[PDB]
Amino acid sequence: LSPYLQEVAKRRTFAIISHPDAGKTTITEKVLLFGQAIQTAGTVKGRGSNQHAKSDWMEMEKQRGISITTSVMQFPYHDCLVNLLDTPGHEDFSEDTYRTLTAVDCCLMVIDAAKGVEDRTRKLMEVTRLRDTPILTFMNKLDRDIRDPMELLDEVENELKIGCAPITWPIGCGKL
RNA sequence: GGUUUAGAACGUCGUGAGACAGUUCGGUCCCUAUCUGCCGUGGGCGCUGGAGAACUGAGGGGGGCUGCUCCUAGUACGAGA
Ligand SMILES: Nc1nc2c(ncn2[C@@H]2O[C@H](COP(=O)(O)OP(=O)(O)NP(=O)(O)O)[C@@H](O)[C@H]2O)c(=O)[nH]1
Ligand SMILES: [Mg+2]
């Protein structure tokens, strides 16, 4: 427990991957307020939640349309020091994302519970198994009317060839 | 202020006086309301002995517009926007 091997062990550096518009960038902004980096928060395109607070999608064109290239982040949560990446969704667009995976020891996949598993979701798992990299799964968008979370588990096991272990479970979806 | 008076000029027409549904500058707009109506306000009598109060409510009138924001929710919808 020397001041060296202690700093090392308390660190944790990970990805965040998605099919385009799943919510990487949003869950990221929220992860940032659980780290006391953003005292308020925002949305995307600076949209529906007002205030010139978008944000932390670096660049510029990102804020005009929707997301471009990996923003990177370091903040403290609980007993750890997290290093957070923000991987772009789009076939032609990255690249980069792939090279970014080279910097992560593990990885979190966001899934649109209203959409299930999409195309670049499937392609991203292939790239993942290249390094036997671990995957956390987050089922985003429970504010929306979604599919049966049972069926959502099938699509994840069947099409992504990986076991599902529910930690939490939604009670009602959409307006409920 | 416009434009159908009287002054004056331009262009135009006519020998001319004058003329143009061409133009230009100037140029007196009265009424103390009797009736109807309408807004208000009293007087009289009626209502069945006379009086002071408080009512019922037939009916009449006034009022009746709308923006933006927030919650639902950036949810339904949408590939997105
Ligand atoms: N209803 C709802 N909408 C969400 C949720 N999370 C994200 N969104 C919406 O989904 C859209 C996609 O946002 P974004 O975070 O850019 O997704 P992304 O995965 O970063 N984009 P990309 O995959 O292109 O990099 C946003 O407009 C945001 O409003 C959620 O939990 N619920
Ligand atoms: Mg993004």
Side-chain angles (χ1 to χ4, degrees), chain A residues 18-26 44 66-67 88-89 140-141 143-144:
Chain A
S18 51
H19 180 279
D21 287 319
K24 327 174 91 132
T25 326
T26 296
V44 120
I66 191 160
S67 295
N140 215 320
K141 308 187 175 166
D143 32 307
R144 291 189 180 287

Side-chain angles (χ1 to χ4, degrees), chain A residues 165-176:
Chain A
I167 273 67
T168 58
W169 197 257
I171 306 166
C173 67
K175 297 250 189 177
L176 270 32

